[PDB]
Design an enzyme around this catalytic site. Structure first.
Site, PDB file in Angstrom:
ATOM      1  N   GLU A  12      -9.697   5.633 -14.888  1.00  0.00           N
ATOM      2  CA  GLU A  12     -10.768   6.405 -14.276  1.00  0.00           C
ATOM      3  C   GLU A  12     -11.381   7.386 -15.263  1.00  0.00           C
ATOM      4  OE1 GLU A  12      -8.488   8.092 -10.921  1.00  0.00           O
ATOM      5  OE2 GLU A  12      -9.278   6.419  -9.731  1.00  0.00           O
ATOM      6  N   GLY A  13     -12.680   7.240 -15.502  1.00  0.00           N
ATOM      7  CA  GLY A  13     -13.363   8.124 -16.428  1.00  0.00           C
ATOM      8  C   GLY A  13     -14.218   9.150 -15.714  1.00  0.00           C
ATOM      9  N   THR A  14     -14.886  10.002 -16.483  1.00  0.00           N
ATOM     10  CA  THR A  14     -15.732  11.037 -15.903  1.00  0.00           C
ATOM     11  C   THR A  14     -16.867  10.454 -15.064  1.00  0.00           C
ATOM     12  OG1 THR A  14     -17.097  11.152 -17.919  1.00  0.00           O
ATOM     13  CG2 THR A  14     -15.235  12.678 -17.756  1.00  0.00           C
ATOM     14  N   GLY A  16     -16.771   7.057 -13.725  1.00  0.00           N
ATOM     15  CA  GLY A  16     -16.375   6.031 -12.771  1.00  0.00           C
ATOM     16  C   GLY A  16     -15.062   5.314 -13.024  1.00  0.00           C
ATOM     17  N   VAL A  17     -14.681   4.458 -12.077  1.00  0.00           N
ATOM     18  CA  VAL A  17     -13.447   3.685 -12.174  1.00  0.00           C
ATOM     19  C   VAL A  17     -13.655   2.433 -13.023  1.00  0.00           C
ATOM     20  CG1 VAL A  17     -12.497   4.425  -9.976  1.00  0.00           C
ATOM     21  CG2 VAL A  17     -14.085   2.515 -10.061  1.00  0.00           C
ATOM     22  N   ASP A  82      -5.951   1.980 -24.955  1.00  0.00           N
ATOM     23  CA  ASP A  82      -6.751   3.157 -25.316  1.00  0.00           C
ATOM     24  C   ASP A  82      -5.898   4.023 -26.231  1.00  0.00           C
ATOM     25  OD1 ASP A  82      -5.387   5.487 -23.834  1.00  0.00           O
ATOM     26  OD2 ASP A  82      -5.829   4.186 -22.155  1.00  0.00           O
ATOM     27  N   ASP A 123     -18.957  12.939 -24.524  1.00  0.00           N
ATOM     28  CA  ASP A 123     -17.674  13.099 -23.849  1.00  0.00           C
ATOM     29  C   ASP A 123     -16.545  12.311 -24.507  1.00  0.00           C
ATOM     30  OD1 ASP A 123     -15.934  14.150 -21.914  1.00  0.00           O
ATOM     31  OD2 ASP A 123     -16.244  12.419 -20.599  1.00  0.00           O
ATOM     32  N   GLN A 127      -8.957   8.751 -24.343  1.00  0.00           N
ATOM     33  CA  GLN A 127      -9.094   7.698 -23.331  1.00  0.00           C
ATOM     34  C   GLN A 127     -10.340   6.836 -23.514  1.00  0.00           C
ATOM     35  OE1 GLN A 127      -8.558  11.065 -20.687  1.00  0.00           O
ATOM     36  NE2 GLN A 127      -7.367   9.771 -19.291  1.00  0.00           N
ATOM     37  N   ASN A 128     -11.330   7.344 -24.260  1.00  0.00           N
ATOM     38  CA  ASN A 128     -12.589   6.648 -24.516  1.00  0.00           C
ATOM     39  C   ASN A 128     -12.542   5.855 -25.833  1.00  0.00           C
ATOM     40  OD1 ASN A 128     -15.104   9.007 -23.166  1.00  0.00           O
ATOM     41  ND2 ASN A 128     -13.227   8.150 -22.284  1.00  0.00           N
TER      42      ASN A 128
HETATM   43  N1  LIG Z   1      -8.343   2.904 -20.117  1.00  0.00           N
HETATM   44  C1  LIG Z   1      -8.724   1.774 -20.615  1.00  0.00           C
HETATM   45  N2  LIG Z   1      -7.795   0.837 -20.982  1.00  0.00           N
HETATM   46  C2  LIG Z   1      -8.191  -0.359 -21.504  1.00  0.00           C
HETATM   47  N3  LIG Z   1      -7.282  -1.285 -21.869  1.00  0.00           N
HETATM   48  N4  LIG Z   1      -9.509  -0.617 -21.662  1.00  0.00           N
HETATM   49  C3  LIG Z   1     -10.476   0.295 -21.309  1.00  0.00           C
HETATM   50  C4  LIG Z   1     -11.812   0.005 -21.499  1.00  0.00           C
HETATM   51  C5  LIG Z   1     -12.822   0.978 -21.137  1.00  0.00           C
HETATM   52  C6  LIG Z   1     -14.202   0.723 -21.335  1.00  0.00           C
HETATM   53  F1  LIG Z   1     -15.122   1.659 -20.991  1.00  0.00           F
HETATM   54  C7  LIG Z   1     -14.628  -0.502 -21.899  1.00  0.00           C
HETATM   55  C8  LIG Z   1     -13.679  -1.488 -22.267  1.00  0.00           C
HETATM   56  C9  LIG Z   1     -12.266  -1.271 -22.080  1.00  0.00           C
HETATM   57  O1  LIG Z   1     -11.421  -2.163 -22.415  1.00  0.00           O
HETATM   58  N5  LIG Z   1     -10.063   1.502 -20.777  1.00  0.00           N
END
Ligand SMILES: Nc1nc(N)nc(-c2cc(F)ccc2O)n1
Length: 294
Positions: A12-14, A16-17, A82, A123, A127-128
């Site tokens: 979950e980011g700032t 959206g999910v 991440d 941002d 996590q990004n």
């Molecule tokens: N937390 C997380 N974990 C993982 N494994 N991936 C991603 C991910 C996020 C994005 F915005 C675009 C591609 C992605 O793979 N995010």
């Protein structure tokens, strides 16, 4: 979603999910972000749509932008882990310096590219940042902030992280510059090195004061115009700057010098991504293979 099949809820980011999903028809595995709502600006979809044209090895590719039933879906190429998770997994031994250096170099290449295309992230956080088994690291969610705004939290009662926010944002500046991304990346660089967040604030004022206690309360000498910032208060305590060798031990002087330039208070003095790539810290950069447990 009819076209996919939520393999799992990624995170979950700032904005959206995020979900890991497989395109039932093509079988491609992607990351699907759902944007939270009866207005949905059409100026934003155009803005975001333009991001699909951004292609660089250090930027997560945005494959599609879909507007349907108020919901907005962004389809991204999928990466398995991440940086936050990797740092946590590497907490015992620490990420080897050569890998830290490789990741920093790659992230600056990504920022240099986006910034040259007038795209800011705004941002950035562990996590990004996404990594793969071949030693690459890529930035995800670039430019979404601009095309959008800034919710009180995220979308459904969730504590937004302030740890990587540049001081000018905390002081209420209305106009952001590419420097905000360099600041966030410097905070991340320090965190990879020490294995502890540099400025772990729990409130906007605590975040600001943690920055001041380490780098010294800014003044007009080091930051012309700081006392005129929207949220600047003459009542801020005046803390002395800390010796920089105590902030990120045991990083060497090339690393400390680069970090100091990424953390300058004045956005105008803060090093650009392009200039940072030329810093002597990267003279011996390589591209190591990380030990990734998926
Ligand atoms: N937390 C997380 N974990 C993982 N494994 N991936 C991603 C991910 C996020 C994005 F915005 C675009 C591609 C992605 O793979 N995010």
């Amino acid at each position: 979603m009819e076209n996919f099949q939520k393999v799992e809820k990624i995170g979950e980011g700032t904005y959206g999910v995020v979900y890991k999903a497989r395109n039932k028809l093509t079988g491609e595995v992607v990351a699907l972000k759902k944007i939270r709502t009866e207005g949905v600006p059409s100026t934003a979809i155009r803005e975001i749509s333009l991001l699909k044209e951004l292609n660089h090895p250090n930027i997560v590719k945005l494959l599609d932008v879909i507007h349907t039933e108020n919901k907005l879906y962004l389809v991204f190429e999928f990466l398995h882990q991440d940086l936050k998770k990797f740092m946590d997994a590497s907490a015992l031994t620490g990420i080897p310096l050569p890998l830290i250096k490789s990741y920093l170099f790659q992230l600056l290449q990504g920022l240099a590219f986006c910034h040259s295309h007038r795209v800011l992230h705004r941002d950035l956080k562990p996590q990004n940042l996404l990594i793969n088994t071949e030693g690459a690291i890529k930035l995800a969610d670039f430019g979404l902030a601009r095309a959008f705004g800034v919710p009180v939290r995220t979308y459904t009662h969730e504590v937004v992280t302030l740890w990587y926010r540049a001081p000018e944002i905390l002081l209420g500046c209305k106009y952001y510059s590419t420097a905000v991304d360099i600041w966030s990346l410097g905070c991340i660089f320090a965190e990879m090195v020490t294995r502890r967040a540099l400025f772990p604030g729990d409130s906007e004022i605590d975040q600001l004061f943690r920055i001041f206690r380490t780098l010294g309360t800014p003044d007009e000498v080091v930051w012309p115009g700081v006392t005129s910032m929207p949220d600047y208060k003459p009542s801020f305590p005046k803390w002395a700057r800390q010796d920089f060798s105590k902030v990120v031990p045991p990083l060497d002087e090339d690393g400390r010098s680069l970090l100091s330039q990424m953390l300058h208070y004045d956005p105008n003095k803060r090093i650009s991504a392009k200039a940072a790539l030329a810093h002597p810290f990267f003279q011996d950069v390589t591209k190591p293979v990380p030990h990734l447990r998926l």
